[PDB]
């Protein structure tokens, strides 16, 4: 497993009932009984899929749970629906325009669904017999493919033999052949022939011989975003641009062509459109041209639902010289519905700290948890959340199982919050570097 305990990983879905009524504490999130209801309405808006291009705004003070709400919406949305989570500083690119980066972030969050039914013949090659006619225009073949359970013999075509001459196969080679599409792959070499050649080589790989039946039927459902189709249909070999990011300002005419293509697929009926959510954390630091493109780019039919989070008050919009509410211009605020989050009290902070210490496998006493709750009321919540994990290691250094009040006091002594750091800087301002670069290094005057 390649996942550690993150900042908010206890949140698994929105804690709602069938009637979109939030529980006081369920599946991770505590309190916030109106933002959870509004986010449930937004989740049902996404899951209906009948409307498009609407932006909501999550505004509140810092350390309130806006990104926790976004994580809950992402976890309760489930799979197969795309969820793009970007920050405000990602769109300022050296090789890409701001507007095209916004367009790529818009088109990475809406995809289509393709259903593929396969007929796989996976087995070990034993012998290949090649027969030619008198004219020699076409070549016939015999394939002896073998599983652990059974073995049979198929036939080849001219294109099959030509495609098997490319990527050379011998006896003991594990291949798989699709009946309907004719797809060819070389899985590697069997372990039964791993002791004959005495040296492997560069292109070889050893896989186990498969078991069971030969012709297995299985259907696959693929979810392809529109940005992937845009990248693929813009170059000769475009998947490397998908995995390296050097797409470089894809032209609009292929985007209109792909939009007409997707409409044709939906009308004919081999695909259906899965909308998604684009989440922009810290939207306040975006340039005014990006805001204008966001304003005018939400009226397209192939537009997802945008979630923005801002913890700023009436501040200065970037790129301009005035001040606006939430750091956003009034044209975008007209095209929005605002979800407001409110600060917590002692019991909610108590429950959140209990949940976070429960996940981190830290056992707290009642008095230590009360001290952490008092610190979370006085200082911020994240200070207490980090103090839990530090005090657990302090408890292990004392050879103790559960933490005590003394470990929390030692963690409070050894580590500082913002206010104590500000005070200790202010009473010793001569030893730190000022705005004018003035400092004193010598301690004796």
């Amino acid at each position: 497993s390649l996942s550690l305990i993150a900042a908010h990983s206890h949140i698994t879905g929105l804690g709602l009932d069938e009637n979109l009524q939030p529980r006081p504490t369920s599946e991770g999130m505590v309190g916030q009984l109106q933002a959870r209801r509004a986010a449930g309405v937004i989740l049902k808006m996404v899951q209906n899929g009948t409307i498009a291009g609407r932006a909501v705004l999550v505004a509140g003070p810092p350390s309130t749970g806006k990104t926790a709400l976004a994580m809950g919406v992402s976890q309760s949305l489930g799979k197969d629906v795309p969820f793009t989570a970007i920050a405000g500083s990602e769109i300022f690119s050296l090789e890409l325009s701001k507007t095209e980066a916004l367009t790529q972030a818009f088109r990475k969050s809406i995809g289509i669904k393709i259903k593929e039914e396969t007929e796989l013949i996976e087995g070990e090659v034993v012998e290949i017999q090649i027969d030619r006619s008198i004219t020699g225009g076409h070549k016939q073949g015999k394939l002896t493919i073998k599983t652990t359970d059974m073995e049979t013999i198929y036939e080849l075509g001219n294109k099959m033999i030509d495609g098997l001459t490319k990527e050379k196969v011998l006896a003991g080679d594990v291949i798989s052949i699709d009946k309907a599409s004719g797809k060819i792959t070389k899985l590697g070499r069997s372990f039964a022939r791993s002791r004959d050649y005495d040296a492997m080589g560069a292109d070889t790989r050893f896989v186990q011989c498969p078991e069971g039946e030969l012709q297995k039927r299985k259907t696959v459902v693929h979810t392809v975003s529109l940005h992937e189709i845009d990248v693929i249909n813009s170059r000769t070999q475009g998947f490397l641009a998908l995995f390296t990011g050097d797409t470089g300002e894809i032209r609009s005419e292929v985007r209109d062509q792909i939009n007409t293509k997707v409409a044709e697929w939906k009308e004919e009926g081999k695909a259906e459109i899965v909308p998604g959510v684009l989440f922009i954390d810290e939207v306040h630091m975006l340039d005014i041209e990006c805001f204008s493109f966001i304003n005018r780019a939400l009226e397209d039919e192939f537009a997802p639902i945008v979630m923005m989070a801002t913890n700023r008050g009436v501040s200065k919009t970037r790129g301009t010289n005035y001040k606006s509410p939430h750091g956003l211009p009034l044209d975008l605020l007209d095209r929005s519905i605002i979800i407001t989050t409110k600060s917590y009290n002692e019991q909610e902070i108590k429950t959140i700290l209990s949940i976070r210490a429960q996940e981190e496998e830290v056992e707290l006493s009642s008095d230590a948890l009360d001290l952490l709750t008092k610190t979370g009321v006085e200082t911020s919540l994240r200070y207490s959340s980090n103090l839990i994990s530090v005090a657990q290691q302090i408890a292990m250094k004392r050879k103790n199982n559960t933490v005590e009040v003394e470990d929390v006091k030692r963690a409070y002594l050894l580590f500082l919050d913002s206010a104590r750091s500000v005070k200790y800087v202010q009473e010793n301002e001569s030893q730190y570097i000022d705005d004018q670069g003035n400092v004193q290094i010598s301690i004796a005057k």
Binding site: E116, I184, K186, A202, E228, K261
Partner: protein, 130 residues
Amino acid sequence: TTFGKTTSKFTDLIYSSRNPIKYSLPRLIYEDLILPNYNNDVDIANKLKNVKFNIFNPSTNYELCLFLSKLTGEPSLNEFFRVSTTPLLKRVIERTNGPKNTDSLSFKTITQELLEVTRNAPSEGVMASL
């Protein structure tokens, strides 16, 4: 150049042009950084970074190969592993116009559609002259 000049039944003419600027490299850097031996791990790390941990390997990443084969339409699932591991000049030199299946996510643009008409078109046609 500093070539082989004459200080004066056939005569041999062999290309022998060199550059007057000589860059001298000690043997130790070559034998201990570029050539594999018993005490270095050039080949081991090369295999480890190019074969075992490659994301286009069908022995470990068959789902991505099938997804990309649906996306592009390549008839072979080892095409991406072969493309990602050979240099660009080698790729453009031996590129072959193999067929692609129609049931895929990619078809032809308008510009290429106009392009394939005028490959061997004669003059006096409107689309060829345009």
